[PDB]
Write a protein that binds this ligand. Sequence first.
Ligand SMILES: *[C@@H]1O[C@H](CO)[C@@H](O)[C@H](O)[C@H]1NC(C)=O
Lengths: 50, 34
Amino acid sequence: AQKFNGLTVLPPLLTDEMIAQYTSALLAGTITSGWTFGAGPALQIPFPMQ
Amino acid sequence: NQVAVLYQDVNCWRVYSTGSNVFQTRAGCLIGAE
Ligand SMILES: *[C@@H]1O[C@H](CO)[C@@H](O)[C@H](O)[C@H]1NC(C)=O
């Protein structure tokens, strides 16, 4: 603490709340649409058949 | 030719010349935008 001499830290661009959103998006796509959403529009498919 | 200014670590109120349109963010304080 007390910032010592003229040294700073600066904040990151993406906050931790937004990062967690991105990972959650990937989980939804792979569970529902398999790997189809990696190229073109997403198509649904039952999980046991996948 | 319009601009804006960002102050790094100030509780914007040590700033000297300020008018309206003040706003404090996590990074610092910004004057010149709405
Ligand atoms: C900034 O000023 C406000 C009002 O003067 C005060 O409540 C606050 O504790 C100060 N510091 C920060 C980090 O907001």
